Design a protein around this ligand. Structure first.
Ligand SMILES: CN1[C@H]2C[C@H](OC(=O)[C@H](CO)c3ccccc3)C[C@@H]1[C@@H](O)C2
Ligand SMILES: O=C(O)CCC(=O)C(=O)O
Ligand SMILES: [Fe+2]
Ligand SMILES: [Sr+2]
Ligand SMILES: [Sr+2]
Length: 327
């Protein structure tokens, strides 16, 4: 592979990462209190769980994966239309809601992730936003509009389960804290040397909560510097708690630290729905949960200020929130 994609020695993935047998798989059609309790335990102990029987149509999940795969099969002349000034955009502020193709890496030793990402905003859905989405394939806009609404519906159900678990009023996150919905469609082409590369460097999702749809292996979670493989369940969503939710819960909940490894033989598409605050938001531990026994571990901070650090500084997983740590 090009030296551009060679990860630093310490960040390279070992070849035999074990299946995470203890990754919670939570059936959302269990009794209400059982669902709240199982989600609460997963949030406290892991920060990553899968949801099944989640009420989002399986047919729509399949149709969305199909149209996302069809997009990444488009020829160069079509993909160029989403490359500003002839090259992929960077994950940096301002992060615009119009559709673009993105490149990503780390400036520490600088290297690139073995990944192409299509990203666009999804909320609120209006003609201007959808008109800024891919023109091809022809059905992308119709399918992904329906998917966007359904994934948001499921995310808001999960956030209300989280509210009940924490003792926050229902709808606590149904406001500026969930206003941005970025859909990141990740394409991992086959890689000649998986031992040297990463599809996605180890990270927290910096936002509130992410729902991830996958049908192939490659996703790994950090649990004593131990990585585990997250079983692909094509009809499930992987729920990743973001660094923003870790802060708001005053670390009562864990954030998901995860990475993606490359494959030498097959390509892989994943669909990540990033829900989180507007860039104008102030983030702090929920005052409702604080006491002398539970003092705040973070001072209030600008989500925009956090965002700039989160997207630039990859010296540590929580580099984005280190400046705001107290007590
Ligand atoms: C591997 N990279 C991580 C960092 C960055 O994430 C973002 O760009 C999100 C997109 O919502 C973001 C979160 C919080 C603040 C700003 C941006 C781009 C991608 C994502 O898949 C996660
Ligand atoms: O491709 C995956 O399974 C992970 C995607 C992801 O972590 C992300 O987009 O943030
Ligand atoms: Fe992620
Ligand atoms: Sr180009
Ligand atoms: Sr347009």
């Amino acid at each position: 592979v090009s030296e551009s994609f060679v990860a630093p020695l310490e960040k390279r993935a070992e070849n035999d990462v074990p299946l995470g047998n203890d990754v919670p798989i939570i059936d959302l059609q269990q009794d209400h209190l059982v669902v709240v309790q199982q989600i609460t335990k997963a949030c406290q102990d892991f920060g990553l769980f899968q949801v099944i029987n989640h009420g989002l149509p399986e047919k729509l999940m399949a149709e969305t994966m199909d149209v996302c795969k069809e997009f990444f099969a488009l020829p160069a002349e079509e993909k160029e239309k989403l490359q500003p000034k002839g090259e992929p955009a960077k994950f940096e502020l301002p992060l615009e809601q119009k559709a673009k193709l993105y490149v990503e890496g780390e400036q520490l030793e600088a290297f690139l992730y073995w990944k192409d990402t299509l990203a666009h905003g999804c909320h609120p859905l209006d003609e201007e936003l959808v008109n800024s989405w891919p023109e091809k394939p022809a059905t992308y806009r119709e399918v992904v509009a329906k998917y966007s609404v359904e994934v948001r519906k499921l995310t808001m159900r999960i956030l209300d389960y989280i509210c009940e678990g924490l003792g926050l009023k229902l709808g606590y996150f149904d406001n500026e804290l969930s206003q941005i919905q970025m859909m990141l469609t990740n394409y991992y082409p086959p890689c000649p040397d998986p031992s040297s590369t990463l599809g996605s460097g180890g990270h927290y999702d910096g936002n509130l909560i992410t729902l991830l749809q996958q049908n192939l292996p490659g996703l790994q979670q950090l649990i004593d510097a131990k990585w585990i493989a997250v079983e692909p369940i094509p009809t499930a969503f992987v729920v990743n708690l973001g660094l923003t939710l870790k802060v708001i819960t005053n670390e009562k909940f864990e954030g998901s630290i995860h990475r993606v490894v490359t494959n030498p033989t097959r390509d892989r598409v994943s669909i990540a729905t990033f829900i989180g605050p507007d860039y104008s938001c102030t983030i702090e531990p929920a005052k409702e949960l604080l006491s002398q026994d539970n003092p705040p571990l973070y001072k209030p901070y600008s989500y925009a200020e956090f965002g700039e650090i989160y997207l630039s500084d990859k010296s540590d997983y929580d580099a984005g929130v280190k400046p705001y740590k107290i007590n």
